[PDB]
Paper text:
We solved a 2.6 Å resolution crystal structure of [name], a class 1c aaRS, from the eukaryotic pathogen [name] with its cognate amino acid L-tryptophan. The sequence homology between the [name] and human proteins are 46% identical and 65% similar amino acids. For example, in the [name] [name] crystal structure the three residues that make hydrogen bonds with the cognate amino acid, Glu124, Gln119, and Tyr84, overlay almost exactly with the human structures homologous residues. Any compound that would have selectivity between these two proteins would need to utilize more than just these three amino acids in the aminoacyl binding pocket to gain selectivity. Differences, especially just outside the aminoacyl binding pocket, need to be taken advantage of when trying to gain selectivity with a molecular probe compound or potential lead compound.
Aminoacyl-[name] synthetases (aaRSs) charge tRNAs with their cognate amino acid, an essential precursor step to loading of charged tRNAs onto the ribosome and addition of the amino acid to the growing polypeptide chain during protein synthesis. Crystal structures were determined for a CysRS from Borrelia burgdorferi bound to AMP, GluRS from Borrelia burgdorferi and Burkholderia thailandensis bound to glutamic acid, a [name] from the eukaryotic pathogen [name] bound to tryptophan, a HisRS from Burkholderia thailandensis bound to histidine, and a LysRS from Burkholderia thailandensis bound to lysine.
Residue numbers in the entry:
A (entry chain B): 24 to 266, 274 to 297, 312 to 383
B (entry chain A): 19 to 302, 310 to 385
């Protein structure tokens, strides 16, 4: 229930007026995420759209927390949204890899969290962001470049707030408690040398990242910075239709994919996982529409739905692996270089 | 109580060991050279595991010193020089490394200050410290803001081992504390571990000369040593020089008029001491135990026999309070003057050598 999720976090409901505006402003149709309700919520997107209308530049900011097995396809969603956004407005993108957060939260040696951090970057670079417009960084290694901001953010946030907003308690470690300043800092242009002096930030994130951003927004004025704007993506469910072997991984083979879908995909179009997967990955609106119409009229079977989902997901992973196989460890360096 | 302090109540309220003359003797044998007068005159009163640091030395194992200063807007008073003098000595006696954390972060995080200022003040305090004349080849002085990231791993590892329950019980944090403050003790703890500095031997033991008010950081550091696979730091504690009325053995300054500052003119030093220094003298021997001028000498008179001569003479009424004050004036005066002429000669080249982690 998406209205209840919006109510709990207290952000705004996304709407199609905002998609039209974005389409109008980009001279190209809004990415289908905005059209299919995958982007369902926001804070101040209108204001970021106003920034584009006034031909002022904005920049994107998103993050990823390590915890490596291979990444699955659900993990690509905000990053795809950033790719489209970068390619539409040829704008800069900063990606935070939270090796520190994963270390501080999970039972994990730091070297491993950092090691997973690097693979996640290789995996993320795969989606083909512009190296001249994208800065991806490890927190452990590189959040000190905006140390001043971290301190400044940290000073404005008392434990009272930290607890209420994040649910810390007497057993939270003092790293966890300090960490939100490191997630908030990249929300401000002053955090990066390579970004214009008062560029607005746009933060595409799982809705569940919101508290960082309501908070960042509350402290912006006190810090003399522009309020970031944010947009939220629904989370792709696993194939059973929920949140192990029923996720679709980025290193799954073509046959592994056809297996997982035929076996586990729950098959009434509001409950149908194969359609839902299609909502997220099938490029063609006229095509997707055929299947929504088709299943609804009973002119298409669950067998056919599964199988169209199969080939679409197969087209996606195959594109991904074709690029992945070619990401050299040299290529990784262009993205993490600050200088 | 002007000079006299119940050192044992201070030692018990913290959980540390008391210093003894056995440890100074051990220090003499091991360095060949005599033990710094700090160790002989009661100024090093408490410690944790100094016997073990001595055992490291005796075992041809290296150690390093670590100490700190939070920068302030204000000129620091001569009291502030005490643990840094102890380091200068320890460094020269063992030709060992020293790391000095300037906590511009802490001062920013705790005070009503722009970060820019804390950092500026930090940079002045590095000039202030270098003045005391350390070995450029063995001393790393750094700002936390610029430089603590070279040990962000240790900060992160340390941060994992300290929960809020503990952070509060130990440091007195509350709901109105900011989250920078709460995380800060990991940053003070980190330099206790040789791995926090690339240029120090794999597992060299740390020795922290400190005000006892700093113990909680080190008790905690020692508690997390095993957790981190690191050697427990040793710690020795200095009794703080009192103000001229005695009493305020705070690193913080009470009534400026009753403290001697590193920028006081010679006549101010005389005026201040003669006017406000509380004396042991009787109405009409002398009461050494409360005599503030003698206490100052205990801290600053680099000559043992001359100290003994004033002590003796005082106890048997052979020396007057005016005379004790007088000698106290000359000693403080010379110390401040040598300090000030040294400050002038400190170039930025001097400074840049102390500041650069690449030197080692
Ligand atoms: N903490 C997030 C990662 C992250 C950091 N910064 C972000 C900004 C936007 C979205 C996500 C992030 C996670 O565990 O996944
Ligand atoms: N909290 C200390 C600063 C400090 C950091 N590390 C230290 C090590 C030793 C002594 C003091 C310090 C102070 O303001 O005094
Ligand atoms: K900037
Ligand atoms: K080391």
């Amino acid at each position: 229930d998406y209205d209840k999720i919006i109510n709990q976090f207290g952000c705004e409901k996304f709407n199609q007026a905002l998609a039209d505006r974005l389409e109008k402003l980009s001279g190209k149709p809004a990415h289908y995420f905005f059209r299919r309700g995958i982007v369902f919520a926001h804070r101040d997107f209108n204001l970021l759209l106003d920034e584009i209308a006034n031909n002022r530049p904005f920049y994107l900011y998103t993050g990823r927390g390590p915890s490596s097995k291979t990444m699955h396809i659900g993990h690509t969603i905000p990053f795809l949204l950033c790719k489209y956004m970068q390619d539409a407005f040829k704008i800069r993108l900063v990606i935070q890899i939270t090796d520190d957060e994963k270390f501080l939260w999970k039972s994990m040696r730091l070297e491993d969290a950092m090691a997973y951090g690097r693979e996640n970057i290789k995996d993320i670079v795969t989606l083909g962001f512009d190296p001249k417009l994208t800065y991806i960084f490890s927190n452990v290694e590189a959040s000190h470049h905006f140390e001043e901001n971290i301190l400044k953010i940290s000073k404005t946030i008392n434990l009272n707030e930290a607890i209420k907003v994040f649910g810390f308690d007497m057993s939270s470690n003092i790293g966890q408690v300090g960490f939100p300043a490191k997630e908030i800092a990249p929300c401000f242009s002053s955090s990066f040398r390579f970004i214009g002096k008062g560029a607005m930030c746009l933060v595409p994130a799982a809705v569940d990242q919101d508290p960082f951003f309501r908070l960042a927004r509350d402290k912006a004025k006190a810090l003399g910075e522009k309020k970031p704007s944010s947009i939220y993506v629904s989370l792709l469910p696993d194939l059973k239709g929920v949140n192990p072997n029923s996720s679709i991984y980025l290193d799954d083979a073509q046959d592994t994919i056809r297996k997982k879908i035929i076996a586990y995909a729950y098959s009434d179009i509001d409950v149908d996982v194969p359609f839902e997967y299609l909502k997220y990955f099938l490029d063609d609106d006229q095509e997707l529409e055929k299947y929504r119409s088709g299943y609804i009229k009973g002119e298409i079977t669950s067998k056919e739905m599964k199988e169209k989902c199969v080939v679409v997901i197969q087209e996606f992973v195959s594109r991904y692996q074709e690029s992945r196989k070619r990401v050299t460890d040299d290529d990784l360096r262009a993205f993490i270089d600050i200088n």
